[PDB]
Design a protein around this nucleic acid. Structure first.
Ligand SMILES: [Mg+2]
Ligand SMILES: [Mg+2]
Ligand SMILES: [Mg+2]
Ligand SMILES: [Mg+2]
Ligand SMILES: [Mg+2]
Ligand SMILES: [Mg+2]
Ligand SMILES: [Mg+2]
Ligand SMILES: [Mg+2]
Ligand SMILES: [Mg+2]
Ligand SMILES: [Mg+2]
Ligand SMILES: [Mg+2]
Ligand SMILES: [Mg+2]
Ligand SMILES: [Mg+2]
Lengths: 136, 98, 44, 76, 30, 181
RNA sequence: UCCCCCGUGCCCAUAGCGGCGUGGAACCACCCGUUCCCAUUCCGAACACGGAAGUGAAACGCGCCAGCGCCGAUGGUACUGGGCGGGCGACCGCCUGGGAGAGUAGGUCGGUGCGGGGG
RNA sequence: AGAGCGCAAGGGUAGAAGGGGGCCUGACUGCGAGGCCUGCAAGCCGAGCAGGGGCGAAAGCCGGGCCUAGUGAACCGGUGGU
RNA sequence: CGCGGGGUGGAGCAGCCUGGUAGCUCGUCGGGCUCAUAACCCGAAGGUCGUCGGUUCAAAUCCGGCCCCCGCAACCA
């Protein structure tokens, strides 16, 4: 990344913008609850996704962490926290689309996304595709 | 270009838009905050002969008569992106000389 | 550098601020005293 | 750390509003730069302060490209 | 003044420049 | 001094020829010469103020006009230059003094150029104009050899109402420009 | 009363980028010249002066077209004065009043004052 | 307008506040309607008036730098005048 | 981890404050003395200035962040 040091905490209101639509691939993974997803949680799901089906197709990770996660070294109250301990996170709100595979069968995706679900803190759901876009 | 124009706008009343042609030289006493011309003594497009400079002097005197008739006197001149020296000079020159 | 201007043939001062090394040695700017009106003011 | 710092509040913005009577000289609105332009019977100072020159009522007039002007319509 | 280029090969042109007696050579004539 | 060779060369030769190769409708549409300009990158004369006057006066003769000055604005830290001090030479000429210069050009300068081959037909700005470079300034007539303290280079340009370089190539060749074909 | 122009103010892009076409007697610009007023750190390019020819190309004025810029409802949401309920929490839902942004249909190569020249 | 506006950042700005040349010293004295801000003190804006002076043909602008930081009550004492 | 100091040719130090323009010593290289070597004499080569971004016309030099070295401090319970 790149920008500067620290950022506010902020609350996680309605599941508004934190939500989209299967923009790529065939299948997808949607969050049911709000939460800051850690960089490790992402890597955890990603590796587990590709490691399941070897030489798999293409995996799209729509979300992206950029919020500095603050934290203090087990002391008290001098200034703002050093943060960075857990690294970064992404404002994931219900409805959002974290992962979505492509160029692969339905069983591989059904299992891989299911697996990559446990790698994530939030209770999730898997959506097919339908045709819901925006046209005529 | 029209900096000068805007300077006079906020100044007061009775502007004197001196738009001159390469051969003609018009002149109007427009009052802002309403947009209405009063004494509009044209030059070549009016009656005068053919001598831009001397024609300017007279057309300026033309404003004076028509103006002094309506009870005006505020000399709110309007350079109108023009250097004061030649044609436009005689304009306010003759108009103010009487 | 703190500067103070004096009046010619009289005794009056004024607030000022000259420059040390910067191009500025003397100060021959005009000014307005109380007695009479307008007379040249030197640095001094 | 080294951060706890902030110049106190200057308390700027719109002081007078449209539909308000005013004396002569009232600082109609203080501003940072030219968030508002002068106008009919309205002068300004170094800090771009808007203030009445006459007695009357405040009025606002947006004009897109030109900007937002403010003036006082005289009456008595 | 009419600068007469006296290029030594058979050409004397009356242009315009300082000093008419312009001694040149190998001009456009050759 | 409104009278010379190149003068009438444009009128009674190039003017009609341009009506042939393309053909126009208005006399004000036919490509007209109207602006010649000179220039001298004098990052050299930065140190010496004397060397600057020399280049300008040598320039005054060849241009048959009055020289001018134009300093930089940025700051070439790499070459001892910065804000507003150094120098750059330039002199714009038109009307009569324009034609007289173009005469010395293709009749005195170009000829005795070091192994002259022509003028690169690619030097067009893409539009109806042209720009060329020149080293030795002594190639000009009035310039004496036992006087030039330095072979100060310089490049010149020339503007025209032309909008296509084809009209430019045609116009210029008719004007007597020896293009390196 | 009505039409085309010159000036000049109002609405502040539905009035502009652009491609094409039209206009010259009249208005306007360009164009001729540099003696005089005046001027370009160099140039009559512009600023200025005395004015015939030519043009309407440049620029400007008037029309046409929606490729870009621009304006853009309707319906439904998001959010929220006020009232109320559910969870352990992160939070979620209902009554009343209010209600965008985005996107879609669509709309635009401008309207309008006063003075002046010509029919 | 994404530059520039001496120096931080912001609001502002080419319909100048930005770059250049000419003349020149309002980087005046004596005042100050009426205001913003405000516990106090302090800070900040300012039309208009008089004397007198600069630039401009003039309408007019000038009571220091586009602006908001560049500062210190009182006491005690220094120097020049009244 | 709190305070201060410093990373510069192969080794050890200067240059930083007050910005342009890398200095000394040993070592290495070529040459000469000597039967030979060392010493000694002559000439020469070698630096991304820890690392990334920034300030300026321009950064070893000024400012800010990270890695490593050195010195101090860490008390009352
Ligand atoms: Mg889960
Ligand atoms: Mg036609
Ligand atoms: Mg909308
Ligand atoms: Mg800016
Ligand atoms: Mg200025
Ligand atoms: Mg200034
Ligand atoms: Mg008070
Ligand atoms: Mg203060
Ligand atoms: Mg007075
Ligand atoms: Mg005491
Ligand atoms: Mg080391
Ligand atoms: Mg040994
Ligand atoms: Mg210790």
């Amino acid at each position: 990344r790149m920008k500067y040091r620290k950022q506010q905490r902020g609350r996680l209101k309605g599941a508004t913008k934190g939500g989209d639509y299967v923009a790529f691939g065939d299948f997808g993974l949607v969050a049911l609850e709000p939460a800051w997803i850690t960089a490790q949680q992402i890597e955890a799901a990603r590796v587990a996704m590709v490691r399941h089906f070897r030489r798999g197709g293409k995996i799209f990770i729509r979300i992206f962490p950029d919020k500095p996660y603050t934290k203090k070294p087990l002391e008290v109250r001098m200034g703002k926290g050093k943060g960075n301990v857990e690294g970064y996170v992404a404002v994931v709100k219900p409805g959002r689309v974290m992962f979505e595979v492509a160029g692969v069968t339905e069983e591989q995706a059904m299992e891989a996304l299911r697996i990559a679900g446990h790698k994530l803190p939030i209770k999730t759901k898997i959506v097919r595709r339908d045709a819901y876009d925006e046209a005529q | 270009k029209f900096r000068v124009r805007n300077r006079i706008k906020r100044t007061g009343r009775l502007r004197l838009s001196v738009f001159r042609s390469l051969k003609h030289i018009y002149a109007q006493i427009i009052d802002d905050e309403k947009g209405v011309t009063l004494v509009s003594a044209s030059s070549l497009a009016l009656k005068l002969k053919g001598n831009k400079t001397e024609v300017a002097r007279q057309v300026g005197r033309a404003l004076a008569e028509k103006a002094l008739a309506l009870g005006i006197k505020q000399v709110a001149f309007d350079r109108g992106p023009y250097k004061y020296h030649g044609r436009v000079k005689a304009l306010a020159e003759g108009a103010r000389e009487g | 550098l703190l500067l103070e201007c004096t009046e010619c043939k009289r005794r009056n001062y004024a607030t000022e601020k000259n420059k040390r090394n910067t191009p500025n040695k003397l100060e021959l700017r005009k000014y307005c005293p109380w007695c009479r009106k307008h007379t040249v003011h030197r640095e001094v | 750390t080294k951060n706890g710092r902030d110049s106190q509040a200057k308390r700027l913005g719109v002081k007078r509003y449209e539909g308000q009577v005013v004396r002569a000289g009232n600082i109609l609105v203080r501003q940072r730069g030219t968030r508002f332009k002068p106008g009919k019977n309205v002068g300004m100072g170094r800090d771009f302060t808007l203030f009445a020159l006459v007695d009357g009522v405040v009025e606002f007039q947006d004009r897109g490209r030109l900007g937002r002007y403010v003036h006082v319509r005289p009456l008595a | 003044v009419p600068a007469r280029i006296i290029c030594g090969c058979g050409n004397v042109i009356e242009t315009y420049s300082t000093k008419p007696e312009i001694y040149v050579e190998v001009c456009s004539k050759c | 001094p409104l009278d010379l060779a190149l003068k009438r060369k444009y009128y009674e030769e190039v003017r009609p020829e341009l009506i042939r190769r393309f053909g126009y409708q208005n006399v004000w549409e036919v490509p007209r010469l109207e602006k010649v300009v000179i220039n001298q990158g004098l990052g050299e004369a930065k140190e010496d103020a004397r060397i600057l006057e020399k280049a300008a006066q040598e320039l005054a003769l060849i241009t048959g006009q009055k020289p001018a000055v134009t300093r930089a604005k940025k700051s070439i830290s790499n070459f001892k230059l910065r804000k507003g001090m150094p120098i750059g030479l330039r002199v714009t000429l038109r009307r009569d003094r324009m034609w007289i210069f173009l005469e010395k050009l293709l009749n005195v300068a170009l000829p005795r150029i070091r192994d002259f081959r022509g003028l690169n037909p690619n030097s067009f700005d893409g539009r109806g104009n042209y720009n060329l470079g020149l080293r030795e300034q002594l190639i000009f007539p009035e310039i004496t050899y036992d006087m030039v303290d330095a072979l100060r280079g310089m490049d010149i340009a020339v503007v025209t109402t032309a909008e296509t370089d084809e009209e430019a190539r045609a116009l210029l060749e008719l004007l007597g420009f020896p293009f390196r074909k």
